Amino acid sequence: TSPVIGTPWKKLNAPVSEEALEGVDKYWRVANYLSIGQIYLRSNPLMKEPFTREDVKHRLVGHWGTTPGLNFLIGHINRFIADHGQNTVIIMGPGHGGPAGTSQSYLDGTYTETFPKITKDEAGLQKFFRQFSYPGGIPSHFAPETPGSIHEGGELGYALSHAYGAIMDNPSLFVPAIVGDGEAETGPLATGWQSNKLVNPRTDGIVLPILHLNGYKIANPTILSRISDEELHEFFHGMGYEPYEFVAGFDDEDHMSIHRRFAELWETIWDEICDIKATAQTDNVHRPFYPMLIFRTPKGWTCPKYIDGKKTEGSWRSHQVPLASARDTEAHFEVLKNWLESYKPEELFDANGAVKDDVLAFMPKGELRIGANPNANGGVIRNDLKLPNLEDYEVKEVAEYGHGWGQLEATRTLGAYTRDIIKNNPRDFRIFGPDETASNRLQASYEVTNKQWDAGYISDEVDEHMHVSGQVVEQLSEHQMEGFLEAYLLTGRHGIWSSYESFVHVIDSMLNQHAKWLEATVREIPWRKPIASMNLLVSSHVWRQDHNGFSHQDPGVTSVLLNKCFHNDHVIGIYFATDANMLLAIAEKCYKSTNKINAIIAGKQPAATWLTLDEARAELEKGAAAWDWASTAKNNDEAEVVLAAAGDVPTQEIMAASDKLKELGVKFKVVNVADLLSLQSAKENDEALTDEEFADIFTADKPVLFAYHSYAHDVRGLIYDRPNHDNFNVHGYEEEGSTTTPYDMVRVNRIDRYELTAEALRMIDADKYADKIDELEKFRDEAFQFAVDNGYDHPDYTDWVYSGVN
């Protein structure tokens, strides 16, 4: 559960003290000095003479155009957290301002705790300076290695979705979400503005969006900064916000004056937020206007105004590095030396090199710190889900009526299971879906919870299962759902989210980024505890898009997921639910797991059930298993072909083809691969099937016919070094489809039962079976003409039931 920390939502009821703002100004100066020492210096952190070009880095990498503004906001937020005792997580949208975050971690004392070799003295300062963006050092962005970070910020557009996710079901947590003005042009964040219509001020926390409007992107100005102030305020008010505006640094006003003005503006905003929270305890049915801060400052605000006669401060020329070579001229080194001395570090550091005590007296202590906040490290919060007994949801008719029974929909079983998980776990488990929960048949959870909706209600003929609080969030944006769930998991909670297969590509970037958060975490960051897994139910898949057609058919999610399987990280799982029982086993395993991205590919269509629960779990631990009840060959020597399958429709076609093969006396084996990554190379993947086990499943000399859900490229690229891999003949999706009957969909991809039987016959003896092969091939065309003439699939195809049903 999310803990209550400090004294949440308290008003100051006093002026901001002068001593605190003294401390805030000194903090800002020292944070800018650290952020510059990290970029430019490799030695001599405190500029003991001789300070020469020997002390400067050979290759200057990093960013400065956002760092002083971030340091300003972070120092003021630190004063605020010390004063109010607020439970606060900062989300840094422009993550390229990494030196700001590392300077915070260093100054609040958490960096030395996490990394003991970076001491708080001259040698520790030298190591801290050298390690930024260095061989064998720390990254340039706001990284998982950086304490106090739940968001990398490298790939832009997801500060707001992550903020609204982090506050969900989390009522005491305050999140200032700093948003770059260039990042605000990206598609994800524009729609992430509208997510205050999906949170409740009573049951969820408060997100304060700080638009960091410094006017410029890389080498280009931002649209928001160059439209009129009337337009900007009107725009933010049309999205349910009260815009506040702060402008600074565009004239010669004293810094103390700027800090004072910001103190007053910040406390005004905090009082509006506290009023909203206090009102929500009585009335939470009508939405408030949350304050949001527009923070207009010059880009690179403390750097030299002009360098080489080019406007540097207040321009895009300060984005990455002013003084691109302070190492190769004497004039640029003098500019750099003057820039470092303009902060007066001589008074901010003591003799031994530690930041002076009066510079950090205004700082929060203990669990209130940014790097120490448990919501930033959501693995220490996390507790296991309390799971219902799986045998309660098993489809038992397979156990007595025989394999292949029924016309059930696989995802309804997961719906019931997830409903009871929600029942056992309220306020820790949440279901997201881009308008598609009821189309993936996960609506059984409406028996115990509602869709959280905080826009207007109009009627009850149209607004069923909607409520101002709920455990089902549903907005038509995959970016929103994925950011919500990722921030939900990163804070310590659990969740599933469902989607159409073809639109998972919309978040290929986001998944990639999350994999990079996991790949980095499992490799080099032990102090970050495991978080829950990102569970993605992929349904309404390529083979059954009757209503939509070719635009909704693209199973390429498997390919993008296969690219993140390296160095024994195991941060990826791709599971194929052949039926409801296998889906139960997969979902149980996935809900128990940690630090992974689990894509469970299950169909919503009426499909037969093949396994019992014990059989399903037994197939699960191996990933691939032989179906002894479907095989006609007792041992590996007898079979004239191995028929392997991965996916519900490929499984159905393999089984129907096996029925026809039985009538011709063909001895074959039947294999089902539930988990794709078990087929990976044994030396590469230590949890994949060993080579002996793989050869036992697939006969070394005998041909293997493989029917696969996605593109066959993904199977062939995975088994390349496996034994008997030359004989594998993968049949997968082949970018051929439309709106048409279900048999046609598999016909045009050469994955129907007739084509599979003909493929197996050709693997054995093309000459002996020539007449039967011809008969099958002309039957495919007759059965297509049947669907054209009559509008539905052939009775031979529709009515087929496996021979193993009693």
Next chain:
Amino acid sequence: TSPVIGTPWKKLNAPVSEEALEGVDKYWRVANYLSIGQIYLRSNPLMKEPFTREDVKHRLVGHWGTTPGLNFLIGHINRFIADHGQNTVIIMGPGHGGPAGTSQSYLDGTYTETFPKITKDEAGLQKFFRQFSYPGGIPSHFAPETPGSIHEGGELGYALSHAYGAIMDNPSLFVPAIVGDGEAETGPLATGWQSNKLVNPRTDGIVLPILHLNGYKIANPTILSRISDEELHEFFHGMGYEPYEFVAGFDDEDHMSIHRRFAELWETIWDEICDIKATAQTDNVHRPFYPMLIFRTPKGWTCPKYIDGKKTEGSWRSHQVPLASARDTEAHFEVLKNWLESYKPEELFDANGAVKDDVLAFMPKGELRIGANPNANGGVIRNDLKLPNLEDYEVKEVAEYGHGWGQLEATRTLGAYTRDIIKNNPRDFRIFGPDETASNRLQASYEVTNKQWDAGYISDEVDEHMHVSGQVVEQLSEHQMEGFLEAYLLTGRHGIWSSYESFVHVIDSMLNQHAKWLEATVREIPWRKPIASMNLLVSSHVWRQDHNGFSHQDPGVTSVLLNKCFHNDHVIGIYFATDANMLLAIAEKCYKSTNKINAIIAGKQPAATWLTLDEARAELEKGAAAWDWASTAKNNDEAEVVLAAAGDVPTQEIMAASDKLKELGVKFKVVNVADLLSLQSAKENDEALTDEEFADIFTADKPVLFAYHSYAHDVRGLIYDRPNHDNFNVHGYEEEGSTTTPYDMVRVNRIDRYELTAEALRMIDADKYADKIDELEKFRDEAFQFAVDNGYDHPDYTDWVYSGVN
């Protein structure tokens, strides 16, 4: 179910024709002429010469100060109903404007249909004129004998509650509720203004309040007319209305100019109403501002301006009768003759005396007429409730563990029964309660319906079971609830309403009025079909008001109900539920009944159960029955006393006293009277117990001890001519109570078990039982001192269970 009539909520989308307003003016003139002929004329309706004082009534009775304004509004509403085809019921708040209603019934043709002897010619006009307020004629007010009337209007303050009741669950019905400005000063109607917060524009109809602000009461001006127009509009807007205002007749403007102006204003109001209705089909969660019309006119608007030098028109002098004696002077007769000729009746009537055809061409036809509308005669709409099987709700533990078992609450059984009646009958059965449904334990109906509430919603920690539509209405006003239910029944629907016993007095007037609507209906009005019964669950009665005390104890409802039992009308039923099974039988009988007021007095406290369902019904058909299982005497000769009871606490005390009497060998009988009115005189009440049956129940010579719920006066006034009535010793409530333990409440009223045993012993032998009587009397005082010392009742009293429990 409420029928859909005509084409509801249709906009005209055209100007009001000139021909229609020609007709409206001619209608208004002829309606005023009829309303004056009724008051003043007994002969010569069309003033054929010689028109002399012979033609005038000897005793002029009736009212005129509201009649021409009512005729104006009714003629315009008639034009509106003809044009739009609206389902409309008019509620006439100032019911003393009876000639207006009878003139309408006469002019739209329904009066001749209902009363064939009032033809539409000269003789019929003469009879119509003479019969108003005459010996052997029709009443002065807007009476049940008057077609098109659901509201008498004699006793003021309930036009608005009746309107909002008539539109409930009735979505196509339009109700213009005409409200007198003096009547608006009464307490009931002031709170009946606020009832637009309890109706839904989608599921309920539309009430248009027309404030008939003619400035004067009887001999006094009204508060609303003499406050500023700003105040009046501000007041009506603070109650959720849009005030429209029409002013007429206060200058020399032409009548047509007034009819035209009213046509535009009326169509504007209708368009706002139609907009509200169309919006409600999409959004019904947010309350609209319903239009209401302020209709400022001079009182007695077409009468002579001055009579005897006194301002008559536009004054309170025109309330009842200008020209109080047009029979006793020649000058007043000339004033009357000029008044009648000012309407030019010579052109409004043909030779034979019928109203000319062009005067009524604009009139509605068929079912759309006011007197023909089925919602005015709610007995033709009515259908029986579909009732669940009673045996499903029986308390079966009495059948096997023995009589006297348990500590159940009686009203929870009725709650479950009513819940299933609601389930079987949605939109035809409704539960009302003055904030007291959950305190009478009728909340089992929240399993199938909600409280209808259309004010604001704030949270869900406080707003459970509330919804913009529902079958439970609940406002803290007994007037509101009773008017809602009475208009609900008068329109054809069914309902229960619950209340504390002591506050039923708040509606003694209203009940009286409804009884007068029923007494008149069952005697002389056959064409009015039976309506459902007014069912009043009286709970939280006098004997168990622990929290409240003396202010909440007044059982005087029985007395006011007994005053309406005359002439074999049977419009009253008073039932005492001794336990849950008897309550089931009573409620089943009451829900089946028609044209009655059924007061069911049941306790909400934990009380023992004495009867099985079959026994309860067997006691029910007789009203009084002997308990053979509790009697120690086999025949009427053996018993030395008869112990009779009526009420759950009196029943408990009789049974506990019978237990003590058994230990002393006393032979007694036990009688329970479920229905009070069976004890009435046989010759007076043909459905009461005959004299032989009464003597069989109560032994002729043997003393009878009667324990009664209410004041003993009510029992003694009922059995006065019955045999053995001299020996009856009634023990009832005696205005002695407080906040104290339950035994104390019956102690201070001489109705406890010890005092009852002593009473019975004194009836037999005071001398023989002197020691035992003394012991009982001092035990009462010891058991009171026990409660004073320890705070709860004696173990001898609390723990007592009947000896018949196995």
